[PDB]
Design a binder for this molecule. Structure first.
Ligand code: CLA
Ligand code: CLA
Ligand code: CLA
Ligand code: CLA
Ligand code: CLA
Ligand code: CLA
Ligand code: CLA
Ligand code: CLA
Ligand code: CLA
Ligand SMILES: CCCCCCCCCCCCCCCC(=O)OC[C@H](COP(=O)(O)OC[C@@H](O)CO)OC(=O)CCCCCCCCCCCCCCC
Lengths: 74, 165, 73, 81, 30, 165
């Protein structure tokens, strides 16, 4: 997917304009809240849903992670 | 020079053109913030409080349907509606509307020119039909202010017993 | 969206009145945004500090189960 | 917003703060500092913080201290002129 | 315990990715 | 402006040439995204979603004679059909998409010219008048934009509450 995206963003109609690259404010906002924060939120979600139950002997996987809440109170 | 408080000079930024103007800015809040933002906040608070007062009275007197009927007094309604999920739904929809209103108000304060507390919501066209919508706008603001005070009261009164008046 | 900080103003505004920093940070916004080498160097330096920090902290504060007994790793 | 002299222009404070007179900012900063210090002292200094002692009010008050510093700087900037 | 089918489909997806890499590089255009 | 949202300025980038345009973009994404590709993607989503809705609704009452085709809910159905059939349909769709590839990423053609066209349907559209062309295009866009939310709600309801109803 990333290789395809790299090819795609070299097409004339998809190549981002120069002003887009130098949009410092939006880049910082997204790469802080999105790339760092949401990513960390997703990782802690993984730890709560998968890592911790797996460490406590409970098998959580894609086939059963939607019906077994990580905490009994939920 | 102010109609409400004659000790203070006529507050700046309150030209009198705005409906409901009684020149009441004793702490000079209007000078601090862009006036249209404050007007939108006032109108939104007033509308929400009108709805809240009507809901409080109606719930205290009448109840919708089973489950909703069991809870009775509005004090123990936030909890119950949380339990059976109504609060989540209304939160979701109000959040969607508010999120769109974010860009709506961002357009304002930037020169878009949207009237404070203005949307396209006039299905019956009361103000659209009437050239003199000033009466309607003033009435909305005043009844909303009364609703704000009344809801504040009702809540702080029922939180201390006092049964129902 | 109206709300937020504009970084050029921040950089231009931080010039102590004592004058010990001269013109302060005036003109740094343009140099950083227009120069890829400066921001590349900043990113490389921060990444190097973080790599050193990971090296220093993983050994002292073991994050992985049963590591610190696999000495070679 | 580059400024020389001894006091920055009010526009550095932003659209809202720049319009607030100095005494208002001073009183607000004093209130904020008092509340923040009192909150930070009540929990974790005068009382040990536990799992079941997390008061949201004290957290907000503690966060209010940097607001107090910012408001006191803004009050000085407004005072110089 | 990965079966031969798993290895084969991994190889197929790797071949697709390799072709995409070929095309991307070609498009970087020397 | 912005017929769809009365209180937001009409998004600058978009203009009526695109069928289904009502100036809805509140986030101003239209100024950053290739609108031709976005229109093509939206149209493909519309057609896929409409087919999915009709399929789930028809399947909800009758099925093919085979027992393993007798699954009642969409999710149980995907779980029950053997892998061979899924691979077969996927291969058909993959062939169609690979055929579509070269035409999709052009820029001298409209969205309807990008997605593969049924020769009978394309000929019928070409024989149609320009006004009727636009009318039919708008019809398709709107019916499909309803069908997308329809299918999303359908699948979410099936997953959460058992049956898609
Ligand atoms: C939420 C939205 C979002 C997201 C997710 C991203 C994400 C990304 N952007 Mg994009 N970008 C955005 C919005 C976003 N951007 C916007 C709005 C703009 C317009 C201004 C741009 C403009 C832009 C440009 C111009 C470029 C990117 C690039 C990148 C990539 C940076 C390289 C990388 O792999 O990250 C690294 C990701 C991390 C999570 C690492 C975090 C760093 C810390 C130090 C690591 C620590 C992690 C942990 C503690 C270590 C343990 C892990 C270990 C056990 C494995 C990344 C995929 C660059 C790129 O490579 O393009 C493909 C690039 O050139 N972006
Ligand atoms: C601020 C506005 C507001 C808010 C937050 C609520 C919130 C609530 N109302 Mg109230 N309500 C309102 C305005 C409001 N209402 C107005 C204007 C009316 C008059 C039409 C009502 C009439 C009303 C009735 C008749 C009932 C509720 C009920 C409820 C609860 C479930 C949602 C529901 O069925 O509503 C719809 C929830 C606590 C139900 C409930 O469980 O009572 C607590 C219920 O039986 N409300
Ligand atoms: C009961 C008092 C009251 C009065 C007199 C008005 C009067 C008005 N409202 Mg308000 N409004 C009220 C209660 C009231 N509203 C409440 C309780 C709500 C919350 C649901 C709203 C939400 C609301 C919105 C969202 C909008 C109005 C708008 C309007 C104007 C046109 C609608 C119309 O036909 O008028 C009756 C008019 C000045 C519209 C406006 O000003 O733009 C035309 C508009 O956009 N009102
Ligand atoms: C229009 C609004 C309104 C009205 C008619 C009243 C009327 C009254 N109040 Mg209430 N009150 C109001 C707003 C109002 N109050 C507000 C805004 C607050 C919060 C600041 C309070 C808080 C309040 C308290 C805490 C008490 C009253 C009490 C009283 C009674 C004296 C009287 C019935 C007393 C009471 O309960 O008497 C029945 C009482 O103890 N008022
Ligand atoms: C710690 C350093 C710091 C400093 C000195 C300031 C100072 C300021 N901020 Mg910033 N801000 C900060 C951190 C900081 N903020 C952080 C961490 C965030 C992210 C939550 C923000 C998000 C933020 C927004 C979204 C806005 C400000 C605004 C402002 C100004 C008005 C403050 C106000 O209304 O008080 C109360 C003021 C110049 C406002 C402004 O005028 O910006 C130009 C504005 O719109 N700030
Ligand atoms: C010696 C310390 C020092 C001093 C004297 C100043 C002085 C100044 N700063 Mg800087 N600043 C500093 C450290 C310092 N800064 C540090 C360590 C940071 C964090 C990295 C910042 C981040 C910062 C930002 C982001 C901004 C300033 C701004 C300003 C100016 C007005 C203050 C203001 O608007 O706050 C008033 C603050 C409030 C009313 C509420 C603040 C609420 C909390 C902090 C959030 C003034 C020239 C502003 C400026 O001139 O930029 C145009 C501005 O926007 N400062
Ligand atoms: C992170 C690694 C990396 C990346 C992203 C790039 C990226 C780039 N390089 Mg640089 N380069 C690198 C490493 C890298 N290079 C190294 C290590 C060297 C040697 C020191 C060079 C030397 C170099 C030169 C001399 C030039 C570039 C050029 C380029 C550009 C396009 C080249 C291209 O793909 O054309 C198309 C190439 C291909 C499509 C070939 C792809 C290779 C395929 C995937 C190999 C697959 C074989 C497979 C493993 C076989 C297994 C079979 C098995 C079953 C037996 C692009 C900017 C050119 C450029 O743009 O200059 C401005 C250029 O002139 N590079
Ligand atoms: C988005 C389009 C779409 C997709 C992905 C599917 C996919 C599927 N359909 Mg549905 N179907 C569709 C459109 C679609 N169909 C349309 C347009 C109709 C109307 C003719 C039907 C009518 C239909 C019936 C009547 C049945 C299926 C069944 C099936 C499954 C086996 C294939 C089959 O019998 O074809 C057909 C498979 C999961 C069968 C199944 O397993 O359902 C439980 C089945 O009995 N489909
Ligand atoms: C226009 C599309 C549409 C329509 C007509 C309905 C209609 C209905 N939904 Mg569905 N729904 C939709 C979209 C839709 N929903 C979407 C997009 C979602 C995802 C947020 C849901 C999520 C959803 C849930 C989770 C539930 C419903 C339920 C219901 C029923 C009340 C009613 C039959 C409820 C139901 O099944 O009633 C018994 C129910 O529990 N819907
Ligand atoms: C150990 C440092 C390692 C990191 C490398 C250095 C990076 C940071 C450099 C600044 C360090 C802090 C400087 C304190 C500098 C400091 O606190 O004073 C700041 C002051 C200048 O402040 P301003 O010009 O902002 O103040 C304006 C005046 O009119 C007072 O309002 O300088 C002096 O008072 C005289 C010189 C310092 C004498 C200090 C004696 C104690």
């Amino acid at each position: 997917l990333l290789l395809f995206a790299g090819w795609l963003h070299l097409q004339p109609k998809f190549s981002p304009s120069l002003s887009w690259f130098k949009n410092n404010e939006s880049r910082l906002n997204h790469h802080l809240s999105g790339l760092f924060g949401v990513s960390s939120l997703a990782w802690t979600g993984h730890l709560v849903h998968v890592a911790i139950p797996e460490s406590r002997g409970t098998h959580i996987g894609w086939d059963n992670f939607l019906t077994t809440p990580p905490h009994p109170d939920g | 020079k102010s109609a409400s408080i004659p000790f203070m000079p006529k507050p700046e930024k309150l030209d009198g053109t705005v409906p409901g103007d009684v020149g009441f800015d004793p702490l000079g809040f209007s000078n601090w913030v862009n006036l249209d933002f404050l007007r939108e906040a006032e109108i939104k608070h007033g509308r929400i409080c009108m709805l809240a007062v009507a809901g409080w009275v109606a719930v205290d007197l009448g109840l919708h349907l089973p489950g909703d009927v069991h809870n009775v007094g509005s004090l123990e309604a936030h909890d119950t509606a949380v339990k059976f999920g109504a609060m989540s739904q209304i939160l979701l929809w109000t959040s969607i509307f508010e999120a769109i209103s974010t860009v709506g108000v961002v357009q304002m304060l930037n020169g878009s020119g949207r009237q404070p507390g203005y949307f396209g919501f006039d299905p019956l066209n009361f103000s659209k039909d009437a050239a003199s919508k000033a009466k309607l706008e003033l009435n909305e603001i005043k009844n909303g202010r009364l609703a704000m005070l009344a809801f504040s009261g009702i809540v702080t009164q029922a939180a201390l017993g006092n049964d129902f008046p | 969206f109206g709300i937020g900080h504009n970084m050029k103003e921040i950089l231009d505004a931080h010039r102590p009145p004592g004058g010990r920093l001269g013109a302060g940070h005036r003109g740094l916004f343009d140099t950083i945004t227009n120069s890829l080498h400066m921001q590349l160097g900043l990113a490389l330096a921060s990444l190097g500090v973080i790599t050193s920090l990971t090296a220093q902290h993983m050994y002292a504060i073991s994050p992985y189960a049963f590591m610190a007994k696999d000495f070679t790793t | 917003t580059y400024w020389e002299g001894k006091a920055p222009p009010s526009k550095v404070l932003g659209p809202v703060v720049s319009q607030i007179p100095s005494p208002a900012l001073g009183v607000i900063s004093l209130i904020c500092l008092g509340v923040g210090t009192y909150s930070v002292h009540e929990s974790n200094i005068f009382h040990t913080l536990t799992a079941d002692t997390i008061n949201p009010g004290y957290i907000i008050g503690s966060l209010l201290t940097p607001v107090a510093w910012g408001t006191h700087v803004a009050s000085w900037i407004q005072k110089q002129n | 315990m990965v079966t031969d089918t798993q290895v084969f489909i991994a190889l197929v997806l790797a071949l697709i990715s390799a072709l995409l890499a070929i095309r991307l590089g070609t498009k970087l255009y020397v | 402006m912005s017929k769809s949202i009365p209180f937001i300025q009409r998004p600058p980038a978009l203009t009526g040439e695109m069928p289904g345009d009502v100036g809805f973009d509140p986030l101003g994404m239209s100024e950053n995204l290739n609108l031709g590709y976005m229109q093509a993607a939206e149209l493909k989503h519309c057609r896929v979603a409409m087919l999915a809705v009709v399929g789930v609704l028809v399947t909800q009452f009758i099925h093919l004679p085979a027992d393993q085709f007798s699954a009642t809910s969409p999710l149980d159905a995907i779980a029950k059909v053997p892998l061979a059939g899924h691979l077969q349909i996927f291969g058909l769709i993959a062939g169609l998409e690979m055929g579509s590839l070269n035409r999709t990423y052009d820029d001298s053609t409209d969205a309807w010219g990008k997605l593969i066209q049924d020769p009978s349907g394309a000929k019928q559209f070409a024989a149609k008048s320009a006004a009727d062309k636009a009318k039919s295009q708008l019809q398709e866009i709107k019916n499909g934009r309803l069908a997308m939310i329809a299918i999303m709600g359908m699948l979410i309801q099936t997953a959460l509450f058992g049956h898609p109803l």
